[PDB]
Design an enzyme around this catalytic site. Structure first.
Site, short mmCIF file in Angstrom:
data_model
loop_
_atom_site.label_atom_id
_atom_site.label_comp_id
_atom_site.label_asym_id
_atom_site.label_seq_id
_atom_site.Cartn_x
_atom_site.Cartn_y
_atom_site.Cartn_z
N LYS A 195 -1.79 0.25 6.74
CA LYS A 195 -2.77 -0.39 7.60
C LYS A 195 -3.27 0.58 8.70
CE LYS A 195 -1.65 -5.36 7.48
NZ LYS A 195 -1.14 -6.42 8.41
N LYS A 199 -7.81 -12.00 -4.18
CA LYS A 199 -8.91 -12.60 -3.40
C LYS A 199 -9.89 -11.55 -2.81
CE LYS A 199 -6.72 -13.07 1.08
NZ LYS A 199 -7.16 -13.81 2.29
N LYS A 245 -3.37 -9.27 -12.17
CA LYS A 245 -3.41 -10.58 -11.52
C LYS A 245 -4.70 -10.76 -10.73
CE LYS A 245 1.31 -11.90 -11.82
NZ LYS A 245 2.56 -11.13 -12.12
#
Ligand SMILES: [Ca+2]
Lengths: 332, 332
Positions: free
Chosen positions: A111, A196, A193
């Site tokens: 991050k 989002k 998978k």
């Protein structure tokens, strides 16, 4: 009953893979486990948020969880910032967390690279708040994403260290691994998978997505060039067709063998039409329930107020114990 | 009236230098200013504390501030941990503080990675909690010792950064400018300010010290070798004699010139004996008052309860505006 703590980012966005894979199973477990659902608004602000969107998305998440079947009388559902004990315990736990345990975090380093313009102290310190979130409720089990394993391990280490110093104050939490839900993969790349935040929106179906868009996406889902068309399950050789079967199975509860029998002699178009109908039906119903909750401000306020009271009554027991152990004069 | 915020470490150990400088001036200004005194137990635990001693020292601090004249009807005096808003605001402000800013507040540039990795996160993050403590009360002025200047500058920088994003939510705090005047100096090194942390205890007089010890330390105070021995104020050439006159003047209220005339023709032994009598009398009285508060558990509770309720009433107004600006759903 074992205490299960799950933190939900305020987004309103849940993929069908998430729902059928996990949340939908958890909704059926509210009598057997003592489930606590926390909408983690305090965590969201480690990145800069648009203030209107943050408020809106908090309410969207709550209405969505209610529409999915989380029952505020059976479970505890609340907004994080409404329970002061989270922030209070987070400060105390800072004092029993090593700087090195935070500086070595993969997520912090990752991050830090992506939010290079906003490396704030919240981004560094949020594993401590996560630990506080969990430990406050005497939590036994936590559903952990692959990216959250290291954060769960910090929670356990802090709890262990604190208990070794002061006695058994916290429970040592474990990973929540319930039995497999539906298998759901991305529609254009069925080896991965659903995510989002995929740049390829045709991969992903979200719960609040316009049913018309969902149907289009399913109708163009990747399938093979087998001649003749054969609706048969084989993840290695027919991943696209297999994923359509797995998704339909996840909606109807029909077994893979049952569906293969049902689709004998049929075209891929027929399988896609079936999947599109079943998914659209499920999502349209869920969306009507969402709307009914989302538009009822008084009901949302009641649920948040009651949830926060339930949560605070549990949290304050643990915080009082922590403060007692550390040596603080108890509030009169 | 301007709002003044001061954080007090839970110690019970204050020197006569603290008292005659900072604390006593602050006592007599409770009418000109809206004063807030916070016993900072949450800061204390950034270093390991024996629990029983921490609890004891929190009460010691409160009873000592009451004995010294801090009036809980004129001022707001409270224990930090009794006001959840400090911790709540601290988490929020983490998110508007740069990791780089806290890193530069530490000794890290001078020290090993092993050292940095082994400190607790509380020690790293306490400047944010300090910012929160101040900003929560719309504070105009903060009494800052030289070593706390960096900390006040960070508070101002956080406040301005936040206000620039969200509107004028915080007051930008300023340093409190103390009364110009002589400092009480060390008894065996009168060119150095009297300090709590001095390893030579003969330099220091504490408010709760045995009056026999106080008298002994004063009678042995270092003075000059002038011949003839003259009791005249001159900090440059007669530091020790000057310090004794300053201390006596601080006790009796007599001006320095009044004292110089009084001691005409007298020996330094006489001055030292007079200072010792006056300080011993003052501390004896102070200690009697301290015991009166410190053994009155019900009164201490009453003071803490009322102080925390007054503080929370103010803190909650500011925390609500901060949360609203950030974008959280308001407390339901
Ligand atoms: Ca002079």
């Amino acid at each position: 009953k074992p205490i299960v703590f799950s933190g939900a980012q305020p987004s309103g966005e849940l993929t069908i893979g998430n729902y059928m894979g996990a949340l939908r199973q958890w909704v059926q477990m509210q009598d057997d486990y003592d489930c606590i659902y926390c909408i983690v608004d305090l965590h969201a602000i480690t990145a800069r948020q648009d203030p209107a969107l943050l408020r809106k998305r908090t309410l969207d998440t709550l209405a969505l969880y209610l529409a999915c079947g989380i029952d505020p009388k059976k479970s505890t559902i609340f907004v994080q910032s409404h329970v002061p004990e989270h922030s209070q315990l987070s400060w105390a736990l800072n004092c029993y967390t090593y700087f090195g345990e935070l500086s070595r975090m993969t997520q912090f380093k990752d991050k830090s690279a992506r939010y290079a313009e906003n490396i704030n102290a919240g981004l560094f310190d949020y594993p401590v708040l996560m630990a506080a979130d969990i430990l406050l409720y005497q939590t036994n089990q936590v559903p952990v994403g692959e990216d959250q394993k290291q954060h769960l391990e910090l929670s356990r280490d802090i709890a262990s260290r604190f208990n070794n110093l002061y006695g058994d104050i916290f429970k040592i939490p474990e990973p929540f691994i319930p039995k497999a839900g539906a298998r759901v993969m991305s529609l254009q790349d069925p080896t991965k998978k659903m995510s989002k935040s995929d740049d390829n929106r045709n991969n992903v179906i979200e719960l609040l997505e316009d049913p018309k868009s969902v149907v289009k996406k399913i109708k163009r889902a990747m399938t093979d060039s087998d001649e003749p068309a054969l609706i048969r399950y084989d993840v290695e050789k027919k991943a696209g067709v297999s994923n359509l079967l797995d998704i339909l199975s996840g909606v109807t509860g029909q077994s893979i063998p049952e569906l293969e029998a049902q689709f004998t002699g049929q075209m891929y178009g027929h399988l896609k039409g079936a999947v599109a109908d079943a998914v659209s039906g499920m999502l349209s119903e869920l969306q009507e329930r969402y709307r009914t909750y989302r538009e009822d401000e008084a009901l949302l306020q009641d649920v948040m107020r009651e949830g926060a009271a339930k949560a605070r009554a549990r949290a304050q027991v643990t915080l009082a114990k922590v403060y007692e152990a550390i040596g603080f004069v108890a509030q009169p």
